[PDB]
Amino acid sequence: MGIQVIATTPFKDQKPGTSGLRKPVPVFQQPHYLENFIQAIFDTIEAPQGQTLVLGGDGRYFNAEAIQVILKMAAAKGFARVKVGQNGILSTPAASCVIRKYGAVGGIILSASHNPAGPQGDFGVKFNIANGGPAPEKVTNAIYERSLALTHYSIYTAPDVNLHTLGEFPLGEMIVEVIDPVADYQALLETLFDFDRIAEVIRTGKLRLVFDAMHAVTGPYAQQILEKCLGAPPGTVQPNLVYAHDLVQQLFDRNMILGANCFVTPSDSLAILAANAQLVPGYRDGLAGIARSMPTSQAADRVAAKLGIDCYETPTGWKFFGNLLDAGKVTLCGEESFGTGSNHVREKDGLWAVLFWLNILAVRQTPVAEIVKDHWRTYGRNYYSRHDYEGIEGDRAHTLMSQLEQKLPSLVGQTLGAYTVATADNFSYSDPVDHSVSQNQGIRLIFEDGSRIVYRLSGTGTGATLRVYLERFEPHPSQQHLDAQVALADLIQLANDVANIQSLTGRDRPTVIT
Template identity: 65%
Template sequence: MTAFTTIQTRPFDGQKPGTSGLRKKVRVFQQPGYLENFVQAIFDSIGDCTGKTLALGGDGRFFNREAIQIILKMAAGNGFARVMVGQGGILSTPAASCVIRKYQTFGGIILSASHNPGGADEDFGIKYNIPAGGPAPEAVTEAIYARTQQIDKYRTTQVGDVDLDQLGEYPLGDMVVQVFDPVADYAALMQELFDFDAIRALFAGGFRMKFDAMHAVTGPYAKAILEGLLAAPAGTVMNGTPLEDFGHGHPDPNLVHAHDLVEALFGADAPDFGAASDGDGDRNMILGRGFYVTPSDSLAVLAANATLCPGYAKGLAGIARSMPTSAAADRVAAALGIPCYETPTGWKFFGTLLDAGKATLCGEESFGTGSDHVREKDGLWAVLMWLNVLAKRQQPVAEIVREHWAKYGRNVYSRHDYEAIDSAAANGLMEHLRGLDLKGQSLGAYKVAFNDDFAYTDPVDGSISTKQGVRIVFDDGSRVVFRLSGTGTEGATLRLYVEQFQPDPAQHHLDPQVALADLIKIARDVAQIEARTGRTEPTVIT
C-alpha cells in the first residue's frame, strides 16, 4: 500500500465558486497550495471518496496538464480507486457529463474557464460536477467555499506523473488512472439522438457548412463527428486543433470573437450553415447564409422542431430557460401545451428540472442550449440538432426562422455587455436599480408594469435563490434586465438585456438595434450606465 502524504497549508482568500466553478488568472492558480486547497475542499465536501471513481479532464488551456497531474495524485491520496481522464487531458464539459452519467462515477472535476481567454497571463478554472452529471448545486459550492476558509492541510501521493497521451490503465499509488478516448462515448450518444443517415445525405447532396472550433476543445469532437461519421468535406471544421492559448483568440462564440466564421457566412459564396463553440464545448452560435440566429430564437426553433429528431420523437416534457433569455420559447411551450420554466442564470438551476423529468430542452441567452441527454449545456449537440432539422425540412436557416416568427411572433432581443468595469461601480449601479420603485411610471413611450430583483424558488427541491437580476417590465410585455455576470476574472461584467415582442411580420426584418433603440436608451438612462461606469458604449453587442 502506498502511503499518502499530508501537506500543511493555509487558507487563500477569494476561493468562492461563481456560477460555474472557480475562475482566476493562471498565476493565481500556480501559487503553491492554491489549486491543492480547492481540490481538497472539494474532496472534503462531497463525502467519503474511498473506492470511488472520478472523471477528470479539461479544455486544454494553459496549465491544464499540470493541474491534472496534481489532481490525480491528490485523488490517490484521498482514497479514490480510479480516475478516468480524457486522453491528452482533453474532455469537453458536455462529454464529461456524458461520461459521469454513463459510468456512474462519483462526479467529476472539469478544468476550464469556458469562453474566457487562455494562456500564461489569462484565465483558468475548475469546477466539480455531481454524480448526476451537472454542476454542483449551491449547497455543495457553499460547502466547498466554507471548507476553503478553514483548510489547514491537504493529502497527496508522492509518485511520478502519468502519461496522459497513451490510452490505457496505469497504476498511481493504489489507484488506477484510466486514460480514455474523450470523444467515443459522446459520439455514441449523439448517434442515439439524431438521424445521422439524414445528415450524411444532406452533406452528400452538396450542403456546405463551417464549424469554428476556435482552437478549443470541440476540435477533436467536431472532426470525428462532422468530418468523420457524417462525411462532411475535409476543411468543414475551422481552427480544429486545441491550443493552450486558443491561438491567441478569445474562445467565445459570438459575432465579435468568431469573426472569421461570421465573415465566411456573410461573404461571397457563403456556405449554407455556420456554427461555433467555445473553450470547453458547452456553448454554440448558429448562423445561416447571411443570417444570425440569436440563442433565444435557437432554443425556440429547436423546441418547435424537436420531434424531427429520433431522440425527441415522443415530444418534450417541458422547456426551461434562464430569466434573461427571451420569452420566444414560452410561446412554443404554450402552443405545445407544455410548461416553460424560468430560472436564474446558471446551468445548475436546470438540473433538478431535468432529473425530475419536468423539462427536456433548456437554454440560456448566453449561447447555451441543451437537453436531458446530459446535465450541461452542449454546443456540438445544438449544432447536430440544427443539422437534423435542416436535413428533414430541406429549407435554409433564414427561411426556417422567418417562418417561425410568422407563426409565433418575434421576440426582438439584444444583449449589451460592459466588460471589466470597476467592481464597486458595478455594484453601486445594481444597488441603485434595486432601490427604484417604478411601477406605474412612464419611461419614454413605455409604462412600467413592475420592477423587481428576480428571485427563484425551485419547484422540485424548494431551494430559494435571490438577487438574480433586476427586471423592469412594461405594460406591453417589453422588458429590460440588468445583472452582473459571474464568469469573469477581472473587474465586473454588466449585462443589459432588452426585449420587445413584435407580432407584425412586416416588422420582423428590422435590425434589433434599430427596433429596440428607444428601450436601449431608457435602460441606459435609468441605470445611469455612463455616469456610473464611464462607458459610453458596450464592449460587445449580441
C-alpha cells in the same frame, strides 16, 4: 513510494465561483496551489471507498502536470478508479455524460473554454457532482472555506501514469482507466439524432452549418464527429461566420458546409429547436417543458405556449436547470450568450445544438435563413440586445438599482411612451423541487405587448457591471427584418431615462453592445 502528508498553508481567493476556480496560469503553478484546491474538493466526498472519479481537460498548457497531481491525490483519497481521458482530454459535456453513465461520484474538468467569458489565458478547475452537473453554491462555499483552514494535504508519491494509450493501469490501490474521450459521448448523441440523415445533408453540401455557442465547431470532438464520422470535408473544423439575421435581411457548386457557419443566438436558437424538436429521434414524443435563464429572451416562451408545455424562468446559471431536468419538468434549456442543451447531460452542449440543427436542416430540407424567417412569421420576432456598462464605480451602481427598485410599484399600469407596464418587480425564483428561494436576481419591466427591459448587476466583489437587456416583440412579419439596435431604439431610450443611467453613472455609451 507511497502515501505522504504534505504540510501547507492556505491561499487567499480559492473561492470557485460560477465555472470553478479560474486564475492566471502562474497562480495555479504556485507551490501547493493546485494541491490545496484539489484537497478541498476531495474533502467534501465522505465515502470514496468504492467510487469512481472522472478527470479530463482541454490540452492547454499545465493540464498535463495538473492531471498527474490530481491522479496521485485521488489515489491517496481512496477512490477505486479514475476514468481519465486519453491524453488528458475530456470536454465538459463528455465528462457530464461519463459521470452520469457510470454513476461516478463526480468529476474534475480542467478547462477555461466551455465558458468563453473570462480573461483569455487563464487556467481553470471545475468540479461536477454525482448528477453530472456543476457543484451547487453550498458545495463551492464549502470548498472555499476548507481552502482557508487547511494545514496539510494527502498525496500518493509515485511516478507519472502514461495516458497516451487506452487501458487500466495501477496507481496504489487505485485503477487509472484511460478512456476514449469521444466514444460514450458520440454514443449518446447517436441516440438523439439521425446520424444517417445528417450525413446526407452534409453530402449534398447545399446548406450552411448552424451553431449557437462559441467554439462549438472547433476542436477534436467536432473534428471526429462532424469530419470523420459524418463525412464533412476536411477543413470544416478549425470570422468564418455569418449571422442568421443578416441572411434573413438578404432574403428580403461548392460545398456550403466547408464555408461559413451561421450563428443563431441562444435565445432564438432555443425557441427554434423547441419548435422543431419532434423531427429528431431524441425528442419525437415531445418536450416535458422548457427552461431559460431570466434574461434570455422570451422567444422560447411563445413556442411553449403553442405547444402546451410549461416554460420555467430561472436565475442566470446552468446551475438551476439541474433540478428541473432531473425532475422531468424540463427537456430543453438555454442561456443568453452561453448556448443551449437538453437533459441528455447537465451542461451546455455546443455540438449537441450543431447536430440538432443539422438534423432539422436535413428533415425540412431548407436553408437556415428561411427556417428563421418562418419561425418569426409564426411566433413573432423577439428583438434582443444586451448593453454592458463595465467598471461602474462600486456603490454608484448600487444607488442606481436602489433608486429604480423604489420607483417600481408606481410604474405598474402606467403607459410610458408606447409601452404599458404589466409587471415591475425584483426577480425572485422559488425552486419547484428544492423550494429554495433566490432573491434580488434583477429588475424586470415587462410590458403588455410582450416587450421587456431587464437590469442586472455583475462583478459585485470586484468595479461592477450594469447589464441592460432590451427586448422588443414584433408580431408583424413586415417589421421583422430591421437592425436590432434600430428596432430597439425606443426601448433603449426608455431604459436609460427611467433608470437615469447617464445621470448616476456618467456613462454616455454602453461599454459593449451585443
